[PDB]
Each structure stands twice: as structure tokens, then as C-alpha cells.
Amino acid sequence: RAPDSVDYRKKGYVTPVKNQGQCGSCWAFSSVGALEGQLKKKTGKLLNLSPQNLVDCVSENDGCGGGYMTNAFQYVQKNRGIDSEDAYPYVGQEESCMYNPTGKAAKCRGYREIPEGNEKALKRAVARVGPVSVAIDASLTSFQFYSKGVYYDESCNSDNLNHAVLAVGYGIQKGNKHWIIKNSWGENWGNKGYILMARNKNNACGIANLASFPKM
Ligand SMILES: *C(#N)C1=NC2=C(N=[C]N2[C]2[C][C][C][C]2)C([N]C2=[C][C]=[C][C]=C2O[C][C][C]N2[C][C]N([C])[C][C]2)=N1
């Protein structure tokens, strides 16, 4: 049975919150966060991986203009690795795809998608695999200015996916079930960079519509 609560921050599987800056590279940050968890699970080391490597190199995505996490996991697998943040730092604008003869920090062997709209399957994946990359509708002012509590807004549109984040756990606060979400808008956004989003409230904000995790 998947546990009632899981918080990967408490287990040391989650790196510090980053800021994507003036670039719409959320998909890159969501992707490396998931790879960071699997690297930790597999090797015992927690390390910042490189979202810039993905922005500059995943030709199938649109750089600072948006992209898909699956395309990023596919690139890491075909390219035989992703560099660390230290070897390929984030600059927040698209540039040429650079090759670092010794930058390789993690590999990926593929990915799996969570069945569309199934929060129970998402819960199980988080519990057994670790942090999972998810997409949501982040267009509401109530989301943008979130500060605390379990977020739920009836206006959220589960078919309007416009932002990529990372699910690092789930739980319940004052009787309300939630997902623990790591964002990439810096530590000053939300609650130290995180937001608790309603869980089992009918796929609120489309949280379970485009979820995936990398195989390592
Ligand atoms: C993040 N950050 C992020 N930024 C986005 C996204 N769509 C547009 N933007 C920017 C807003 C200012 C201009 C660019 C997304 N979208 C997103 C989130 C999660 C999963 C998928 C996804 O969209 C992937 C396709 C994006 N696509 C690019 C090409 N245009 C023509 C249509 C939209 N995230």
C-alpha cells in the first residue's frame, strides 16, 4: 500500500529551488528535477543537473518558448547523458548547444507516462519512483500570487496546460489532501518556492494530465 504521506524533501532527494529568470524554460527545470531524484535514488549523491543543456540542445522543444518533458528525457537518453549545472551553467536565454568533453553527470534509459487524468496512479508513481514531472494550468492570479495553504480554484482549467513543475510528495493538511509542488520561480515565490495543490479534487488544474518520470 502506498503510504498516506510522502515528502521527498525530507529524504534528501530534492535540490534547492531555482529561478528560471526571463526564460520560459519550466519544462527544462521540471525535467532535471525528476532526473535529480532518480540520480539520488540510484547513486546516493544529490547534485544540480543542467537545465541550460536541455534549453540549448533539445531541438524538438522551443527553448525559452516552452517544451515537453518527455522530449527532454528522450534527448538525455539518445544523447547518452546530461551535464551538471557546474559544467553547463544556466544563463536564461537560448544559446548554441555546447559540448563539454567531461560534463556528463547522469544518464537516462527512457521514461514512462502516468495514465491521463489518474491521480491515484500519480500517487503510486510518486510513492514508488520518486519526484515526478507534471504540467498544470498556472494562468490564474490566485496561483501566481499563492502564499500558503492547499491551493484550489474552481476556475482552473485542466485542459489549459501552460506550466511545468515537479511533484515531490503528497500529504494532507487540516483534512485537505494535497500534492507538494516544487516550482522554479525562485525562493521568493509561493511558500519558499513551493505550493501545496489540491489532491483528488477531480484533477484540479490538470495535475495528472501530462505526468512522466525518467527511467535510470
Ligand atoms: C514554462 N516556463 C512554460 N512556458 C511556456 C509554455 N507555453 C508557452 N510558454 C511561454 C509563455 C511566454 C511565451 C512562451 C509552457 N507550456 C507547457 C508547460 C508544460 C507542458 C507543456 C507545455 O507546452 C509545450 C509546447 C509549447 N508550445 C511552443 C510552440 N508554440 C507555438 C505553442 C506552445 N511552459
Swiss-Prot record:
Active site positions: C26, H163, N183
Catalytic activity line of the entry: Broad proteolytic activity. With small-molecule substrates and inhibitors, the major determinant of specificity is P2, which is preferably Leu, Met > Phe, and not Arg
Cellular localization per UniProt: Lysosome; Secreted; Apical cell membrane
Membrane topology of the entry: Peripheral membrane protein
Known function: Thiol protease involved in osteoclastic bone resorption and may participate partially in the disorder of bone remodeling. Displays potent endoprotease activity against fibrinogen at acid pH. May play an important role in extracellular matrix degradation. Involved in the release of thyroid hormone thyroxine (T4) by limited proteolysis of TG/thyroglobulin in the thyroid follicle lumen.
Gene Ontology BP term (one): proteolysis involved in protein catabolic process
Key words, A-Z: Cell membrane, Disease variant, Disulfide bond, Glycoprotein, Hydrolase, Lysosome, Membrane, Protease, Secreted, Signal, Thiol protease, Zymogen
EC nos: 3.4.22.38
Full protein name: Cathepsin K
Molecular functions (GO terms): collagen binding; cysteine-type endopeptidase activity; cysteine-type peptidase activity; fibronectin binding; proteoglycan binding; serine-type endopeptidase activity
Organism, scientific name: Homo sapiens (Human)
Family: Belongs to the peptidase C1 family.
Keyword set includes Nucleotide-binding: no
Enzyme class: hydrolase
One GO cellular component term: intracellular membrane-bounded organelle
Associated disease: Pycnodysostosis: A rare autosomal recessive bone disorder characterized by deformity of the skull, maxilla and phalanges, osteosclerosis, and fragility of bone.
Cysteine pairings via disulfide bonds: C23-C64, C57-C97, C156-C205
Encoding gene (name): CTSK
Tissue: Predominantly expressed in osteoclasts (bones). Expressed in thyroid epithelial cells.
Membrane among keywords: yes
